[PDB]
Design a protein around this ligand. Structure first.
Ligand SMILES: [Mg+2]
Ligand SMILES: [Mg+2]
Lengths: 202, 204
């Protein structure tokens, strides 16, 4: 599971104080010590959304809750000192963080099938309806080579590989959710569909 | 920005049929072709979460959702046929995939605030602002930062400096407590390092 985590850090002029003692015994300023530690903290949360709020006189957000943590880390790192001023708005920062939780992904289903809905508790279209409610768009891919003509001894015999394929309801599901139905009769055809689907959702 | 995409794949026994012709002209079964194409598709996606639903007689969720595409690709690779029988559950497959979007609907909210100072200036008061974070289900951890009393050699002579006179700890404590978080005081870079490690351990 994943969490959304807001980083609200202090930029007041008092941050410039060389307070912080490292193991080898050196003193460095507060902001530098923070940059170091928090950057390592950012690298640790692989699956989570992080954002950055910087505060003082006025509180402003630096990063709006991206999954991409290299930017959040980098953005924090190029931060400087004394820009904000000598006073701190703690209530401002906490509020802006909370507000940013609210102002915050696109959803897609790719359904692949060789046949009709033979066994199920809930009907396929009622699922597509529920999918629409949750903003999920469904792309549907029917798969089978269909009818093929086999030459033989006596004369023409015809074999159809996918007649179990229900293209009617597969089309409905896609159209209902605002997606498109595709039919792949071979591997080349199949790659193009998915190559196409990638392009449709950038 | 970032997308959530649920892959729903048919594993019914009919998928073992080889009607799928490849580039070079030979034939291969449907699941094999699917494994190929979908795996390649997965590599192409960037910055999106992906999950895997497999169906047949019943539908089940193979991968919840993730930024690691590799695991979705491998767990696809090792899938075999005839475990789920002949029949297909398309509704169940979609309903389960749908469901998987609703667990992404409930992220736990966490704020990490650090400060050297009291809330000297601001229109919004700290404990008001804290109250709201609780209303919005946010657990905020507070970190006080400053050495405190410190012996120092000035040019003029040896001197005792308290470097965090300003630090409001009981406001910072109230904030964390009010919202269910914890308050930490960092008197050096190592305690500071340890402090964020602890917050890592508390939120898993
Ligand atoms: Mg089937
Ligand atoms: Mg200050």
């Amino acid at each position: 599971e994943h969490r959304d985590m807001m980083l609200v850090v202090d930029l007041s002029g008092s941050m410039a104080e060389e307070d912080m003692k490292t193991s080898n015994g050196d003193f460095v300023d507060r902001l530098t010590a923070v940059k170091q530690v928090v950057s390592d903290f950012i690298d640790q949360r692989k699956g989570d959304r992080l954002g950055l709020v910087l505060f003082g006189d006025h509180a402003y957000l630096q990063t709006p809750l991206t999954f991409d943590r290299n930017t959040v880390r980098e953005q924090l790192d190029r931060t400087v000192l004394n820009l904000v001023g000598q006073r701190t708005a703690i209530g401002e920062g906490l509020g802006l963080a909370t507000k940013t939780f609210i102002e915050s992904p696109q959803r897609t289903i790719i359904l692949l099938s060789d046949g009709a809905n033979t066994a199920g508790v809930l009907e396929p279209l009622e699922a597509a309806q529920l999918a629409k409610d949750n903003h999920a768009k469904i792309y549907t891919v029917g798969i089978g080579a269909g009818e093929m003509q086999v030459r033989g001894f006596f004369g023409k015999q015809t074999v159809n590989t996918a007649r179990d394929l229900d293209e009617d309801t597969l089309t409905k599901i896609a159209t209902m959710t605002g997606g498109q139905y595709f039919r792949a009769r071979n591997a080349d055809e199949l790659a193009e569909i998915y190559q196409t689907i990638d392009a449709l959702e950038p």
